[PDB]
């Protein structure tokens, strides 16, 4: 059960480093504003993990309950980590990264709760371009 | 998904499925005036059974 | 149902209809985990 | 039409399925209330009173929506008087909301910190609702065992 | 509250900006220091852009 | 009574007019008092007394600056008004010289330094 | 204690019961005899001998024994009516009858002998279906009416729009006015066919200039009433001739002013706390509200009566022919409707049988 | 003309939604048609508030 | 009870003490308006807000003359 929930930790890990690194003045204006927009979701993840430990101090939270509460995070980090690595390997280190967001946005047309997260990022990161 | 194709195709003549899924499959090439006669087929394996064939023809 | 939705959330080829379907399966399956926590609660 | 509107409004208020003479009883309750009342400050001002005590509780843009969504009826005063006099009665997210890292020409501000304990209370609401819901499920099937 | 990590997370962008503006402006003066921050106005990140637009609007006076 | 109708009556006293006609002004007032409602500034009274004595003395009306000191004692003797500060502050803010630095001096402490 | 009703606002009947949405017996007001005793429509078929002398006139009872004849009629002959076993409610003419009220109250006292009862004020009982406390009382069938209901009840009206015509009185005149329109409709046997011709095909009377133009100048003409029931030519042109009663005194058989302008004058001769406030939410019944569509000209005349019109609107329900009785049913069957209540020996000590003294 | 009445019923929906009334699109649609006859709106509010109490009391 | 007089008098006095403080400050307020303003301020409200509005509503009132 531990191994089943751990992929959200590695999913977070990869976007902390993405937000950190792609801030730097090499990478054009667009790659900054993408790394910028993503900070919001690290806050929300950090907020979540705070309250669960507060719960745990009361004794009122169990690993099976954690496996329930984590589920929106499991999806919403993986929708981001699988976007970061596509900008690393793609080296879309210019206006071309908007193509990767527009394609990924259209791909999630079926998925609503995942589609808004992707529509947010392209609505944000396109502003400098 | 299937209405997100249809409710666009009913107003604006464009389609974008990668792994094929919508029923009004355009064939490639034949971009000349012959487009009107030939270009848009009607994929019989993929009309969604909550609509009739006639309907899939009206939207085509 | 888990092994099915894994082998269909892996590989992109399954299409938009495939995605919305496994999204519905994840959502309707999500409550079954809630119930299992309500059970896990008992001593 | 006139009398028929009181007829089917009573049917709308009657619940979905003894579906027989109660439909007359309720009509008598309607007529009683109507005629015991009949024998015994315009709308724009009325709604501002509600605009305000919304705007103090939180939820300011909703209050803004209310007044802009009805300055538009200049081209229904009695119709509005229904909604205000019935206002209390009813049955008991965004990413662009309060987020400085996005948009174009955001001005200087420095730390809000209340816009963070706001955000931190939302997430506390979404854990607390799903704990009270787990309490309302566990009692239900255990009660019929213990009874 | 996440052992503070939630609250520090927003300061920790401003301080990283200022220390890295300081080490970049080190030793300059005058119009050579008003130029030295006009360098940092060229960035996508609108948060960092807001600080440096403000600080330059001071220094440009 | 409740703040909204009191605020309407306020409008109807400063304006020379009746209740239905002034509703755009009441709309403006609702927009402005709304949100600006919690205490913005930490409120205590040794300061708001000084900030008025100083203004009367500045006007060379130095006797009124000692009459205030006893009117304020009387206002405080009777035990009715529990939020004195606001109505002193309001009257101060409305005051007029019968005939600009403003930032070097003591000011109200900012309250943002605390959380709730 | 399921209450009955009478709804005789004119020469008509409406047997209400248990507060149901419509009266059961809806026959026009007639009695039996030259068969020894019967009801109106039953005895009206044997026209050689068996008839009635209009025991109800156009607006009120013709004699004191006609009320007891109506009591011994379908009020006891039909629909299992038995006033000793449950309450009943009586209608009234404008400002009520006196001798017929005393005789019908004596019938309710001793003959039908009901331990519970209600009486009078039918033109204001229409208000329970009009849906507002102020209003105008154009709310009766048959040969007479007067639109003077209330301010908030209290028998204090301001609009006083009576006339020497009514929703079925003008229909009976317009049945004979097909003969005045040149058609072959002067016979007594054509009064049945022209009652269905001049109340159906004579639809939507309008302004006088357009009605004069459409009769001969324009190609409107009449309907194709060439039927075998006694129809030669229709009353579609008589719909255009009906402004000679609705806007002229004597050109189409009336005595007062024309029915739009007379109502306008009687609504002008009024107080300010009512009438205008009554016409802000007033609503009709009977043959006036069940009219063929000529009420829009009256609404136009009501707009033209006062330049300060004060948003004058008058409603007219399709169900109005029953709603004069259904309004009674509501007005009697509330949980506090004892304003016009008469009863047994708790109230019969002063005598139920008084005209206007005890029952008030 | 007519679609102005449907969008009127969208205004008169959403404002009844934020005023947190208990109402639904059927009752709204008829309540405006009663108000067009001049019927008193406080009197309508008096029947509507008591009819929801009886509606529950039937269980 | 007598406490409905004893406290009403304290209000009669606290109101005209304040009518003095407001006239030494040469403010425009009549006796009534001051009573609205302190009724507001005793509920909890932020004085900066309505003190700005009072001058704005005055500006509108005088500018139409």
Interchain CB contact of A31 with E (< 8 Å): yes
Distance from CA of G320 to the nearest CA of H (A): 15
Q: β-strands G341-343, G282-283: how paired?
A: unpaired
Q: How many CA atoms lie within 13 A of B21 on its CB side?
A: 21
Interchain CB contact of F26 with D (< 8 Å): yes
End-to-end CA distance of chain H: 44
Whole-number Cα distances in Å, A13 to A80, A81, F108:
11, 9, 46
Contact flag B1-A109 (C-beta cutoff 8 Å):
yes
User: Which residue, chain included where needed, has tokens 């000011």?
Assistant: F107
Q: What distance in Å separates the CA atoms of residue G295 and residue G291, rounded to the nearest whole number? A: 7
**Cβ pairs A/E, distance under 8 A:** 42
Please name which of A90, G320, F34 lies closest in space to residue D54, comparing C-alpha atoms: F34
**Whether G227 contacts G203, CB under 8 Å:** no
Contact flag D28-G335 (C-beta cutoff 8 Å):
yes
Compare all CA atoms of chain A with the CA of B5 and give the residue at the minimum distance: A109
Q: How many CA atoms lie within 13 A of G153 on its CB side?
A: 15
**Whether E18 contacts E33, CB under 8 Å:** no
Please name which of D69, D59, D62, D63 lies closest in space to residue D49, comparing C-alpha atoms: D63
CA dihedral G276, G278, G281, G282 (to 10 degrees): -120
Q: G179 is written with which tokens?
A: 């003969």
Q: What are phi and psi of G88, to 5 degrees?
A: -145, 150
Interchain CB contact of A110 with B (< 8 Å): yes
DSSP letters, G311-342, are S--EE--TTHHHHHHHHHHHHHHSTT-GGGEE
What is the C-alpha R_g of chain D?
24
DSSP state of D107: P
Q: What distance in Å separates the CA atoms of residue D78 and residue H40, rounded to the nearest whole number? A: 8
Contact flag D28-G317 (C-beta cutoff 8 Å):
no
Within a 10 A sphere around the Cβ of I42, how many other Cβ atoms?
A: 15
User: Which residue, chain included where needed, has tokens 């003309």?
Assistant: H1
Q: β-strands G282-283, G314-315: how paired?
A: parallel
Show the DSSP H helices in chain G as ranges. Answer: 40-43, 64-72, 74-77, 99-106, 122-125, 127-130, 169-180, 190-197, 208-212, 236-241, 243-246, 259-268, 276-279, 286-289, 295-305, 320-333
Show the DSSP H helices in chain D as ranges. Answer: 3-13, 22-38, 43-55, 60-68, 77-85, 114-146
Q: Residues of B with CB below 8 A from A106's CB?
A: 16
Q: What distance in Å separates the CA atoms of residue F21 and residue F12, rounded to the nearest whole number? A: 10
Please name which of G109, G108, G76 lies closest in space to residue G89, comparing C-alpha atoms: G108
Interchain CB contact of F4 with D (< 8 Å): yes
Contact flag G283-H37 (C-beta cutoff 8 Å):
yes
Q: Strand, helix or coil at F104?
A: coil
Interchain CB contact of D100 with E (< 8 Å): yes
Contact flag A69-D127 (C-beta cutoff 8 Å):
yes
Whole-number Cα distances in Å, F12 to F15, F21, F28, F94:
5, 10, 14, 19
E strand map for I1-65: none
Q: Tell me if there are at least 3 CB pairs under 8 Å linking chains E and G.
A: no
**Whether G14 contacts G287, CB under 8 Å:** no
Q: Which residues contact F19 (CB under 8 A, 6 or more apart)?
A: D41, D45, F8, F12
Within a 10 A sphere around the Cβ of G195, how many other Cβ atoms?
A: 15
Q: What distance in Å separates the CA atoms of residue G167 and residue G177, rounded to the nearest whole number? A: 15
Method: cryo-EM
DSSP state of B10: T
Q: Which residues contact G160 (CB under 8 A, 6 or more apart)?
A: G146, G147, G148, G266, G267, G269, G270
Does residue G79 come out as left (phi exceeding 0), alpha (psi in the -120 to 50 range) or beta? left
Q: What distance in Å separates the CA atoms of residue F10 and residue A73, rounded to the nearest whole number? A: 52
DSSP state of G184: S
Compare all CA atoms of chain C with the CA of D131 and give the residue at the minimum distance: C38
Q: B38 is written with which tokens?
A: 């030939």
Distance from CA of F30 to the nearest CA of I (A): 10
DSSP letters, C2-20, are HHHHHHHHSSGGGHHHHHH
Chains in contact with chain B (at least 3 beta-carbon pairs closer than 8 A): A, C
Distance from CA of A100 to the nearest CA of C (A): 15
Q: What are phi and psi of G31, to 5 degrees?
A: -120, -175
Length of chain E: 61
Q: What distance in Å separates the CA atoms of residue H29 and residue B22, rounded to the nearest whole number? A: 39
Q: What distance in Å separates the CA atoms of residue A40 and residue A32, rounded to the nearest whole number? A: 14
Q: Tell me if there are at least 3 CB pairs under 8 Å linking chains C and G.
A: no
Q: What are phi and psi of G61, to 5 degrees?
A: -60, 135
Contact flag A48-D123 (C-beta cutoff 8 Å):
yes
């Amino acid at each position: 059960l531990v191994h089943r929930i751990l992929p959200v930790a590695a999913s977070y890990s990869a976007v902390t480093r993405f937000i950190e690194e792609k801030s730097s003045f090499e990478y054009g204006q667009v790659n900054h504003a993408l790394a910028a927009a993503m900070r919001t979701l690290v806050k929300e993840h950090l907020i979540l993990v705070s309250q669960l430990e507060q719960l745990h101090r009361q004794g009122l939270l169990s690993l099976q309950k954690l496996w329930f509460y984590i589920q929106p995070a499991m999806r919403t980090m993986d929708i981001l980590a699988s976007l970061a690595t596509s900008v690393d390997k793609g080296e879309c280190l210019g206006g071309s990264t908007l193509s990767l967001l527009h394609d990924r946005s259209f791909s999630y047309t079926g998925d609503s709760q995942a589609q808004e997260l992707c529509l947010y990022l392209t609505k944000a990161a396109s502003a400098p371009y | 998904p299937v209405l997100s194709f249809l409710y666009r195709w009913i107003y604006d003549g464009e389609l974008e499925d990668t792994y094929h899924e919508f029923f009004v499959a355009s064939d490639p090439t034949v971009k000349t005036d012959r487009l009107w006669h030939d270009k848009y087929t009607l994929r019989k394996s993929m009309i969604p059974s909550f609509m009739t064939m006639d309907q899939s023809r009206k939207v085509l | 149902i888990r092994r099915y939705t894994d082998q269909r959330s892996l590989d992109r080829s399954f299409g938009l209809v495939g995605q919305s379907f496994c999204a519905a399966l994840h959502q309707e399956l999500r409550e079954y985990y809630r119930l299992l926590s309500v059970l896990h609660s008992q001593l | 039409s006139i009398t028929q509107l009181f007829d089917d409004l009573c049917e709308a208020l009657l619940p979905a399925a003894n579906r027989k003479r109660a439909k007359r009883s309720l009509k008598k309750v309607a007529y009683n209330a109507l005629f015991t009342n009949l024998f015994q400050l315009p709308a724009r001002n009325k709604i501002l009173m509600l605009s305000f005590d919304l705007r103090v509780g939180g939820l300011g843009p909703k209050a803004d929506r209310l007044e802009e969504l009805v300055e538009e009826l200049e081209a229904v005063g009695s119709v509005l008087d229904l909604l205000v006099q019935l206002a209390g009665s009813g049955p008991p997210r965004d990413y662009f909301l309060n987020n400085k890292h996005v948009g174009r020409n955001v001005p200087y501000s420095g730390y809000d910190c209340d816009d963070l304990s706001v955000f931190e209370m939302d997430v506390q609401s979404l854990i607390s609702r799903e704990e009270c819901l787990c309490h309302s499920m566990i009692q239900e099937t255990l009660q019929v065992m213990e009874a | 509250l996440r052992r503070l990590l939630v609250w520090t997370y927003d300061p920790k962008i401003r301080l990283k900006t200022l220390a890295a503006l300081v080490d970049h402006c080190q030793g300059r003066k005058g119009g050579e220091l008003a130029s030295a921050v006009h360098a940092y106005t060229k960035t996508g990140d609108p948060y960092m852009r807001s600080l440096v637009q403000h600080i330059l609007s001071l220094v440009s006076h | 009574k409740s703040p909204n109708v009191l605020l309407q009556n306020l409008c109807c006293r400063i304006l020379g007019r009746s209740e239905a006609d002034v509703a755009q002004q009441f709309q403006y007032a609702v927009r402005v008092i709304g949100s600006n409602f919690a205490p913005t500034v930490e409120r205590d009274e040794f300061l708001v007394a000084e900030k008025i004595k100083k203004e009367l003395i500045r006007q060379r009306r130095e006797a009124d600056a000692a009459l205030f000191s006893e009117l304020h004692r009387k206002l405080h003797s009777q035990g009715v008004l529990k939020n004195k500060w606001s109505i002193l502050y309001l009257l101060l803010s409305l005051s007029e010289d019968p005939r600009s630095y403003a930032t070097l001096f003591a000011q109200a402490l900012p309250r943002d330094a605390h959380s709730t | 204690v399921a209450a009955l009703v009478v709804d005789n606002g004119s020469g008509m009947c409406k047997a209400g019961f248990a507060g149901d949405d419509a009266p059961r017996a809806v026959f026009p007001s007639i009695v039996g005899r030259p068969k020894d005793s019967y009801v109106g429509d039953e005895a009206q078929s044997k026209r050689g001998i068996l008839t009635l002398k209009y025991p109800i006139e156009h607006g009120i009872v013709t004699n004191w024994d006609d009320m007891e004849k109506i009591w011994h009629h379908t009020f006891y002959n039909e629909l299992r009516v038995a006033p000793e076993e449950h309450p009943v409610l009586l209608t009234e003419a404008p400002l009520n009858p006196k001798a017929n009220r005393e005789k019908m109250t004596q019938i309710m006292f001793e003959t039908f002998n009901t331990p519970a009862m209600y009486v009078a004020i039918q033109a204001v009982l229409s208000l329970y279906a009009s849906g507002r406390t102020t209003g105008i009382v154009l709310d009766s069938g048959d040969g007479v009416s007067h639109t003077v209901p209330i301010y908030e009840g209290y028998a204090l009206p301001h609009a006083i729009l009576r006339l020497d015509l009514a929703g079925r009185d003008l229909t009976d005149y317009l049945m004979k006015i097909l003969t005045e329109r040149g058609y072959s409709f002067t016979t007594t046997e054509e009064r049945e066919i022209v009652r269905d011709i001049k109340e159906k095909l004579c639809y939507v009377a309008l302004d006088f200039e357009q009605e004069m133009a459409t009769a001969a100048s324009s190609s409107s003409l009449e309907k194709s009433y060439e039927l075998k029931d006694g129809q030669v030519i229709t009353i579609g042109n008589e719909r255009f001739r009906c402004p000679e009663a609705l806007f002229q005194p004597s050109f189409l058989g009336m005595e007062a002013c024309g029915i739009h302008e007379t109502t306008y004058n009687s609504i002008m001769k009024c107080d300010v706390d009512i009438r205008k406030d009554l016409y802000a939410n007033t609503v009709l019944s009977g043959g006036t509200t069940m009219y063929p569509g000529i009420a829009d000209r009256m609404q136009k005349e009501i707009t033209a009566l006062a330049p300060s019109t004060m948003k004058i609107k008058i409603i007219a329900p399709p169900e109005r022919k029953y709603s004069v009785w259904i309004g009674g049913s509501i007005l009697a069957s509330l949980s506090t409707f004892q304003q016009m209540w008469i009863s047994k020996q708790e109230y019969d000590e002063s005598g139920p049988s008084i005209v206007h003294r005890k029952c008030f | 003309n007519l679609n102005a009445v449907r969008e009127t019923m969208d205004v008169l929906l959403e404002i009844s939604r934020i005023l947190n009334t208990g109402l639904d699109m059927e009752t709204l649609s008829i309540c405006v048609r009663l108000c067009e006859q001049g019927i008193n709106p406080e009197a309508l509010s008096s029947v509507i508030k008591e009819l929801r109490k009886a509606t529950e009391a039937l269980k």
